[PDB]
Amino acid sequence: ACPLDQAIGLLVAIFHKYSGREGDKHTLSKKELKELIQKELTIGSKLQDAEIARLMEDLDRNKDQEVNFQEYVTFLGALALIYNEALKG
Amino acid sequence: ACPLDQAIGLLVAIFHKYSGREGDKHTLSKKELKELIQKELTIGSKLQDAEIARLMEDLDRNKDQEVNFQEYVTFLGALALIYNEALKG
Numbered sequence: 001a002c003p004l005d006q007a008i009g010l011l012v013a014i015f016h017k018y019s020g021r022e023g024d025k026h027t028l029s030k031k032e033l034k035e036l037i038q039k040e041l042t043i044g045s046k047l048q049d050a051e052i053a054r055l056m057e058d059l060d061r062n063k064d065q066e067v068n069f070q071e072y073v074t075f076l077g078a079l080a081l082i083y084n085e086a087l088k089g
Numbered sequence: 090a091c092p093l094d095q096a097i098g099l100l101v102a103i104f105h106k107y108s109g110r111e112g113d114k115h116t117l118s119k120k121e122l123k124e125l126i127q128k129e130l131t132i133g134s135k136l137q138d139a140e141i142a143r144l145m146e147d148l149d150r151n152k153d154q155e156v157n158f159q160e161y162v163t164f165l166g167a168l169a170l171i172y173n174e175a176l177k178g
């Protein structure tokens with residue numbers, strides 16, 4: 001695969017690495033998502049618990065306490081905007 | 090950098106690489122979009138110009154004939170959904 005497809009593939013793999021641990025196999029519970037963030041996000045392990053909780057809360061748009069793939073994509077987009085904004089100085 | 094950041098970072102770097110060719114250094118013209126697709130997407134080199142034109146029409150939400158980073162993020166999300174399905178079961 002080309003660079004772009006590879007990166008997207010890696011992001012999709014990360015989701016499933018954590019979504020299948022408990023409950024529904026295709027959605028992330030509060031526990032799975034927190035673990036994903038602390039282990040896969042560079043600054044994840046240093047964020048306040050309250051902030052991680054707020055982050056997960058906002059990503060759960062339909063309030064079923066799960067973050068499905070579409071809600072995860074929203075998170076990826078937020079991360080991308082953050083990096084892009086920093087580079088534009 | 091951790092997995093999430095590495096992948097997101099690369100996707101951001103790819104946008105910046107092709108957006109600075111001509112015109113607005115922060116948006117992709119049709120020609121920049123085409124080069125980006127052809128060189129960074131696995132199926133890019135096989136896509137026809139009519140298909141790139143359709144992609145532009147789809148992604149260009151504000152009608153300026155250019156793909157800004159936000160519209161590019163939407164494209165990335167579409168690709169992620171596609172990849173996610175092949176990984177489901």
Ligand SMILES: [Ca+2]
Nearest residue numbers: 019022024027
């Ligand atoms: Ca789960």
Ligand SMILES: [Ca+2]
Nearest residue numbers: 060064066067
């Ligand atoms: Ca949800």
Ligand SMILES: [Ca+2]
Nearest residue numbers: 108111113116
């Ligand atoms: Ca440009």
Ligand SMILES: [Ca+2]
Nearest residue numbers: 149155156157
């Ligand atoms: Ca546009």
